[PDB]
Amino acid sequence: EVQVVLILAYCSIILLGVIGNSLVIHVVIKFKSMRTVTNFFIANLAVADLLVNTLCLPFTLTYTLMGEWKMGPVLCHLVPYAQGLAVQVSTITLTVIALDRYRCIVYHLESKISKRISFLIIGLAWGISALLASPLAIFREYSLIEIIPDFEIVACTEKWPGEEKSIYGTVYSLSSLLILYVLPLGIISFSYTRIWSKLKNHVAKALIVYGSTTGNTEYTAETIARELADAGYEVDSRDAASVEAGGLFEGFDLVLLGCSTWGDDSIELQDDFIPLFDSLEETGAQGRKVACFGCGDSSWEYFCGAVDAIEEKLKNLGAEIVQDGLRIDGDPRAARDDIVGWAHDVRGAIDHYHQRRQKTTKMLVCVVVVFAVCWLPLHAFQLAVDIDSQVLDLKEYKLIFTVFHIIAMCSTFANPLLYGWMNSNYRKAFLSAFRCE
Ligand SMILES: CCN(CC)C(=O)[C@H](c1ccccc1)N1CCN(c2ccc(NC(=O)c3ccccc3-c3cccnc3)cc2F)CC1
Ligand SMILES: Cc1cc2nc3c(=O)[nH]c(=O)nc-3n(C[C@H](O)[C@H](O)[C@H](O)COP(=O)(O)O)c2cc1C
């Protein structure tokens, strides 16, 4: 029985996709751990596929099983619009995800796009796509057709301006297939192809900038630097005395800033570091992974105060602090163990940002591949049987377009499963919501 095999094919999508896509909206909101720019697009994808599992797929089912459109004529226009609207916001949202990642990976940053521009791009996407899919809403027609003398039956189909003029309906079905399926899958493919080699054959680059008056922080910096070199980093030591602040951090995966503490009844930085601190906003620090060390003397009121001062400025500038600062007491040669320890801890933290990157990059690639393969049938169809215009095999054809349409609807419910399976901070977040309910 074909009607029942499509009964549960369409609703398990509805159910797998409402619960699935409701968890993604929820956890990105309830957990500040999860509020990132990438997850806001991921929740935007989720909100696009929720609009399809609850609005479209429910009324689609009943128009397929019964065969008669039993809802209003307003919905006959709106459900095809709400369906086209979703695939465009999805395609725009995935294309933004791929480019943003590519940009963070060349600038060696943890954010390029701000959390407040990301809301503005999410707006344009719904705005630009609500305009691009309005032909889907206007060129629908509500009227009667009787297959045989069944006394009530009404269908819902597309009607393009001419009585036999097919051209408006194909260029739309060719430009949109072009500008919104092979163009954005072209861009996405290009980005992840570059990103992938990048992530595979990169060497980490470290900048060490210290300020040192009698050589203690300088000795500490040489000691850090010998462990990061032994760890496969390409290390770059610069005395603060010899640099200028503009663009100083650009290109580096890791910046360590070392400074000794000075001053009289107040904290002062080491003297060569003052100009770098006064100009720290021109260095490229937002999104940059940093850490801080310094030499001090626990006799003083604020032991290694300069570290705190720098850590707070870097934090104000929106930099991503990666360890708590290292504060050496006395002669750093007598503290070599504490220093080499610290350096090993910084290295491990960088390995986790790098690993978190690879893991999330490969989940994002699975999402697009499961998107493009699932839309491949329907669009193959759409391209073929919109240059042909001869398909009266509708005992097969209508089934061909539905079973093709069911595949594409799997791109809705699939996304929460990939997150839970292939991303451990999602896995834990879903199970941390099903544990407070
Ligand atoms: C499934 C039930 N059935 C019959 C089996 C439907 O027809 C169901 C429907 C349900 C209830 C009432 C009326 C219609 N219809 C199912 C198809 N759909 C629809 C319409 C448009 C899009 N955008 C694209 O594909 C698309 C995506 C990216 C790039 C280009 C295109 C593109 C668009 C237009 C022409 N070229 C290419 C997707 C859609 F899914 C609207 C409702
Ligand atoms: C005048 C003066 C003020 C100092 N103030 C502090 C301080 O406030 N907090 C602190 O932890 N160490 C303080 N120190 C100790 C120095 O930070 C320490 O001697 C350090 O080793 C100098 O580092 P450097 O040789 O790399 O420049 C002060 C030292 C001097 C001479």
Author numbering: 48 to 250, 1000 to 1146, 257 to 343
Lines quoted from the article behind this entry:
The human NPY receptors including four subtypes, namely Y1, Y2, Y4, and Y5 receptors, are widely distributed in central and peripheral nervous systems, as well as a variety of tissues and cell types. Therefore, NPY receptors have been proposed as important drug targets for the treatment of obesity, anxiety, cancer, and cardiovascular diseases. Y2R has attracted considerable interest as a drug target for its role in food intake and bone formation. JNJ-31020028 is a potent, selective, brain penetrant small-molecule antagonist of Y2R, and has been suggested as a potential treatment for the negative affective states following alcohol withdrawal.
In this work, we report the crystal structure of Y2R in complex with JNJ-31020028 at 2.8 Å resolution. To obtain diffraction-quality crystals of Y2R–JNJ-31020028, an engineered Y2R construct was designed by truncating 28 amino acids (S354-V381) at C terminus and introducing two mutations H1493.51Y and S2806.47C (superscripts indicate nomenclature according to Ballesteros–Weinstein numbering system) to improve protein yield, homogeneity, and stability. Strong and unambiguous electron densities are present for JNJ-31020028 in the Y2R structure with the S-isomer fitting better compared to the R-isomer. The Y2R–JNJ-31020028 structure exhibits a canonical seven-transmembrane helical bundle (helices I–VII) architecture of G protein-coupled receptors (GPCRs). The second extracellular loop (ECL2) of the receptor adopts a β-hairpin conformation, which is a common structural feature shared by class A peptide GPCRs. The Y2R–JNJ-31020028 structure reveals a ligand-binding pocket formed by residues from the first extracellular loop (ECL1) and helices II–VII of Y2R. The phenylethyl and diethyl amide groups of JNJ-31020028 bind to a cavity shaped by ECL1 and helices II, III, and VII, making hydrophobic contacts with residues T1072.61, Y1102.64, T1112.65, W116ECL1, V1263.28, F3077.35, T3087.36, and H3117.39. The benzamide and pyridine groups of JNJ-31020028 sit in a subpocket bordered by helices III, V, and VI, forming hydrophobic interactions with residues V1343.36, Y2195.38, S2205.39, S2235.42, L2245.43, L2275.46, Y2285.47, and H2856.52. In addition to the hydrophobic contacts, the carbonyl of the benzamide group and the nitrogen within the pyridine group form a hydrogen bond network with the residues S2205.39, H2856.52, and Q2886.55 in Y2R.
